[PDB]
Amino acid sequence: HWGYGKHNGPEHWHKDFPIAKGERQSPVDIDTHTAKYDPSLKPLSVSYDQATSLRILNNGHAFNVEFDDSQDKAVLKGGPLDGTYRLIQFHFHWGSLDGQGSEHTVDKKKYAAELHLVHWNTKYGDFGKAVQQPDGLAVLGIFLKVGSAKPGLQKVVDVLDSIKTKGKSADFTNFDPRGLLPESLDYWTYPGSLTTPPLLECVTWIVLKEPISVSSEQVLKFRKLNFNGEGEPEELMVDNWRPAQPLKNRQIKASFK
């Protein structure tokens, strides 16, 4: 099945998921000079005060922190969005080295990692329905650079020892995703896709301009995770990022000049 290795990585995914060569694939390179400032865009509204995290899971590709999305507890609104999008999970993509790991790039620059906060449009009732709609999902993407520690990440880092291998889960309650947000909510936005199979073209991407900083020790802990299950040959979970895809007939819009 799909992964990030030599024989099953991003260049192979199109054989099982032909939409991999579609017209609105993600990630993309964000050319900051050709993105268009759009004054019709509203400020984002990030309402995470009542977020209820449940669990953390190693799914063999990344790790996901899952939320209770059965009520409007943590929602994204505004910006380019019409309606209310509920937080269902977040996860990261990261590199084997500090100079790679992000999915989106900015003027071809790669960051050490990228955080995806995944939200679905409540008009569609559940996540599985939402992914089948062109406006089903809103993903808030946040770059990570290596520098000072991010205190709000540490609880995640702490628990990774409990989910080293594929299929392991752990209780992960009372985590506050606000502690992963940078100061500014200035963003770029474009229509795109999931960055992993099934690569569905259901995402309004909102990529924040300002990265967060995490420490060398924090990223190193991500790199100790395993793609494999317990008792299978150890393969470190690193470089779990899809490279930039062609923009095709899309314009990236900026909320800021």
Q: Which residues are catalytic?
A: 61
Residue 91 labeled ligand binder:
yes
Gap between the Cα atoms of 135 and 124, Å rounded: 10
% helix / strand / coil in the chain, to the nearest 5? Answer: 15, 30, 55
Please say whether the dihedral angle defined by the alpha carbons of residues 4, 10, 11 and 14, taken in this order, is positive or negative: positive
The token duo for 99 is 């100079």
The closest of 116, 122, 144, 145 to 205, measured between CA atoms, is 116
The Cα 103–Cα 27 span in angstroms is 6
End-to-end CA distance of the chain: 43
CA geometry: angle 145, 222, 193, nearest 5 deg: 70
Please indicate if the annotation marks 7 as binding a ligand.
no
Question: Does 1 appear as a known binding residue?
Answer: no
104 marked as part of a ligand binding site: no
Q: Say which amino acid occupies 99.
A: G
Please tell me whether 195 is known to bind a ligand: yes
CA atoms within 13 A on the CB side of 195: 29
The whole-angstrom separation of Cα 36 and Cα 212 is: 24
Residue type for 73, please?
Answer: K
Extract the annotated binding site for substrate. Answer: 195-196
Extract the annotated binding site for Zn(2+). Answer: 91, 93, 116
